[PDB]
């Protein structure tokens, strides 16, 4: 174990001697901007999904507008399965809105 390692250290030192010097000059001028240029792309998808809940909430809001229609039995029987459809209609629209924040 004594001879097998500390040749371990020979590798890890060679693994460091160039790694520290090469990376430092490369990433540091670009490290801060490296994350940001995705972060700006991350937030724009995030804010779109936030309105997309709002649009989904608008679909909940129009359901509040469906409520004056919901009292009428004729369209209510249509509405209840459509609300069941609307319930299902959310998921594929929500699964759009869920990961877009992420």
């Amino acid at each position: 174990k004594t001879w097998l390692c500390k040749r371990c250290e020979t590798m890890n030192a060679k693994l460091r001697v160039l790694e520290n010097v090469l990376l430092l000059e490369t990433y540091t001028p670009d490290s801060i901007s490296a994350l940001h240029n995705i972060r700006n792309y991350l937030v724009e998808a995030t804010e779109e999904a936030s309105a997309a809940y709002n649009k989904a909430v608008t679909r909940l809001r129009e359901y509040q507008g469906v409520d004056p229609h919901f009292d009428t039995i004729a369209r209510q029987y249509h509405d209840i399965v459509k609300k069941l459809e609307n319930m299902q209609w959310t998921i594929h629209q929500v699964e759009m809105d869920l990961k877009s924040h992420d």
Binding site: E9, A13, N20, Y41, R59, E85, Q93
Partner: protein
């Protein structure tokens, strides 16, 4: 004693671990946390841009509702367009931002 000298030559290499850390802690953490999320984002962005298409396929499965509702098709349509606008430029401006980092 050369092997022992090589061992002594190892307790010279075991201290540039103790020379580089003042920059390595800057190297070991921030580039790693930055790269790992983007690599995780790489598969995640590949999943972000994709599920639109299965949802386009899934929207066909639930295509019945929007015509029945007063307005449901417009809401999904416009949000996709903003999403489409996200991949519309397709990092072309980001390249220019990447250009400033590259040169």
């Amino acid at each position: 004693t050369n092997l022992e000298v090589m061992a002594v030559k190892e307790e010279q290499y075991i201290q540039q671990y103790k020379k580089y850390e003042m920059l390595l802690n800057r190297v070991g953490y921030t580039p790693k946390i930055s790269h790992r999320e983007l690599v995780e984002m790489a598969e995640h962005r590949k999943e972000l841009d994709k599920m639109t298409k299965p949802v386009l396929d899934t929207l066909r499965s639930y295509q019945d509702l929007p015509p029945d509702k007063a307005l449901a098709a417009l809401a999904i349509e416009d949000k996709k367009r903003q999403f489409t606008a996200a991949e519309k430029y397709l990092e072309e401006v980001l390249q220019s931002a990447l250009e400033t980092n590259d040169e």
